[PDB]
Design a protein around this ligand. Structure first.
Ligand SMILES: NC(=O)c1ccc[n+]([C@@H]2O[C@H](COP(=O)([O-])OP(=O)(O)OC[C@H]3O[C@@H](n4cnc5c(N)ncnc54)[C@H](O)[C@@H]3O)[C@@H](O)[C@H]2O)c1
Ligand SMILES: NC(=O)c1ccc[n+]([C@@H]2O[C@H](COP(=O)([O-])OP(=O)(O)OC[C@H]3O[C@@H](n4cnc5c(N)ncnc54)[C@H](O)[C@@H]3O)[C@@H](O)[C@H]2O)c1
Lengths: 380, 380
């Protein structure tokens, strides 16, 4: 089999070596001429995989993470007999860890009990759906806004955006950025909705920048709004609003998803679908390819306060306050240097693991076991 | 014996029930009237154990674990044949953990490598000497200023203040507050010394308030001085200068030494001293009253980044950023409110353990074992 991968995609050889020959090219340097001897194509959201792009090539499999099934010509793939993988939630778990870390920072500045908060998750797909089950696993109140999922799941309990805004004191956004369609999400949080946020409400946005009206948010905070704000995604990336950032509790350069696992999981998931398509057993796993974690595990004694355990567990793996500190330093120069620094932070992002990889002994304590399980960490 | 103790002194029964009667009183309510029926006196800093208070009473032993020995009339004790104990170092290690947490916070904001700093420790007694041992154990560059110790230990490695202040870019202060003598420490850090600090220098003061000129510090920081500052001790306590505090990376209500085991060790050391004075064998020990840790331990894999391990281990036990958050909130009301809120945080300080009680597995990696031993954590 003859493989072509976008050069940015890691660990292609480890997964696909015994599968045939691998060739690697830049994303936009992959066109009609390159595809002439390609059986399996592995791309990101840069390379074109449309009818125009693919017709006349021996391409039988298209694998990606960055592109959703809304932006793949699946009717064409069916027509041409091309298999596909749009690996769901390649970098999803990392975002869940980031939100948890933000909530911990927020609870700490405020002296708040996280368990008494009312959570509102807008968008409950790969990321939001994972967040929801952590929060609920801990026994916390979660309101879920997801109109599409509501229409397909008549038995589930969903709420409207305006009820969520009415009842939630913690909001986390996890929708795509849709300008059009049935349920548009650009400035889903506009000035009137942001201005109506009750004093002491918390907001996390690690979806896409333009889901929140950044300029309205900045002015609302400058005006003295009583809020806690964590933003991982900004309206003009790599040019984040520096006066908005200065008013955010947590401000990071679109790195929420940037776990070590999340960068390699994309390749692993494509390979799994590729094995499922070919009807072959998997020869190499994500585990096989991941380096050993730095923190194997942690032991709690059964007297440990559950809330204390939660904060200790999450922060031992990842505290976004460290990324926040690096981001503040990136905002010191002129527009041009801030932009370059934004992208450099993302490129040189340090090795960061996921909470699901942490092994936790609890000494058999039930409330501690509940915390480990809700987090998705491993009981040992 | 007939024991009287400040009602806030813990575990007096466990250590003293076998010795006779035990009475308690609030600290400030202890005077010569109250001392008529007392052989063994156990106090805190809030009560004067003076010539006027002790004359005619049968008090033969005095024990204390608190801030300094200024409330004790040590000359009179030597005169009157009164045995005593200040339980030296009872609360020392909590301050060490506090300083480490400050350095971690400071490195994170500045993006600094802790291993590249030059550390100056001014005062190397119970606290400073412990700090020095940690810093040296990690292989870091350390300067020690302690003129009393140097004069008595002339073959030691000591340096003048002037030179320490010129060479060090991280200064931590651990002297007493002395107005007079050959080496007075009131405003040891004054306008000209503070002004001549190399740009980007970190200053930690968890000794006593008036060792640093708070007003001069505040004006320098307002004037744009390139410095990081961590203060646990303030001129005017409980009335911290809020404009100063706002410019400190870390600001806390004099709680550096408020670890749970410090309070227990105080009584336990006093008992050990009491047993020597009475010439009896020690029966009760700290282990008899010490609660189990909440966090038993952490397991590191051999490939763990040493610098990451240091930060993770320290913070897993205690991060003073949490106390800083609670302290920021205490600074919101009027003068009377801030003063009372300062004391409320000290009186109701949450349970907090010591880094020395942490058990760490390292997979036999030498660089990691070095970090664990330097920290004084338990290698397993
Ligand atoms: N910051 C990061 O590092 C990072 C990392 C990964 C993903 N993301 C972003 O997170 C967002 C969600 O990612 P995902 O993988 O979970 O996507 P997903 O498509 O799996 O889930 C999105 C959910 O949003 C719902 N939704 C759509 N419109 C909505 C609306 N108007 N109101 C409420 N819900 C709506 C959809 O039904 C879906 O369930 C995306 O914007 C993605 O780009 C960010
Ligand atoms: N913030 C807290 O919670 C907390 C807790 C414990 C102690 N403290 C304070 O920390 C300081 C030290 O405590 P300790 O128990 O280590 O006291 P200690 O007496 O054991 O040590 C003080 C050291 O300072 C040295 N010294 C004296 N004058 C000096 C000078 N001019 N320059 C340099 N060094 C000098 C002395 O020789 C001595 O070695 C005290 O002020 C104490 O009150 C604060």
């Amino acid at each position: 089999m003859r493989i072509l991968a976008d050069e940015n995609i890691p660990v292609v050889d480890a997964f696909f070596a015994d599968q045939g020959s691998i060739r690697r090219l830049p994303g936009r340097a992959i066109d009609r001429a390159a595809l002439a001897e390609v059986d399996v194509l592995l791309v990101r959201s840069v390379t074109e995989v449309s009818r125009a792009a693919l017709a006349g090539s021996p391409v039988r499999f298209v694998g990606t993470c960055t592109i959703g099934t809304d932006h793949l010509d699946l009717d064409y793939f069916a027509e041409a007999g091309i298999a596909w993988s749009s690996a769901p939630g390649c970098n999803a778990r990392g975002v869940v860890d980031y939100v948890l870390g933000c909530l911990l920072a927020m609870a700490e500045v405020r002296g708040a009990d996280l368990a008494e908060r009312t959570y509102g998750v807008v968008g409950a797909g790969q990321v939001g759906g994972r967040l929801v089950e952590v929060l609920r696993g801990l026994g916390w109140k979660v309101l879920v806004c997801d109109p599409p999922r509501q229409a397909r799941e008549p038995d589930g309990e969903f709420v409207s955006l305006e009820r969520l805004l009415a009842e939630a004191d913690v909001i986390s956004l996890h929708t795509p950025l849709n300008r059009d369609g049935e349920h548009p999400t650009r400035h889903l949080l506009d000035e009137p909705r942001l201005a109506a946020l009750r004093p002491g409400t918390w907001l996390v946005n690690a979806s896409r920048g333009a889901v929140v009206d950044n300029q309205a948010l900045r002015r609302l905070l400058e005006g003295g709004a009583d809020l806690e704000v964590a933003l991982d995604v900004w309206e003009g990336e790599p040019q984040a609003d520096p006066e908005l950032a200065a008013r955010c509790l947590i401000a990071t350069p679109h790195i929420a998803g940037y776990s070590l696992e999340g960068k390699l999981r994309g390749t692993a998931q494509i390979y799994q679908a590729y094995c499922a398509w070919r009807g072959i057993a998997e020869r190499v796993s994500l585990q096989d390819v991941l380096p050993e974690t730095w923190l194997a595990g942690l032991q709690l004694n059964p007297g440990c306060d559950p809330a204390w355990a939660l904060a200790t567990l999450c922060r031992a793996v990842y505290d976004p306050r460290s990324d926040d500190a690096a981001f503040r330093r990136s905002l010191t120069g002129d527009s041009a240097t801030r932009r370059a620094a934004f992208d450099a932070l993302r490129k040189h992002y340090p090795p960061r693991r996921e909470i699901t990889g942490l092994r936790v002994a609890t000494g058999g304590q039930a409330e501690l076991q509940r915390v480990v399980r809700a987090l998705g960490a491993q009981l040992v």
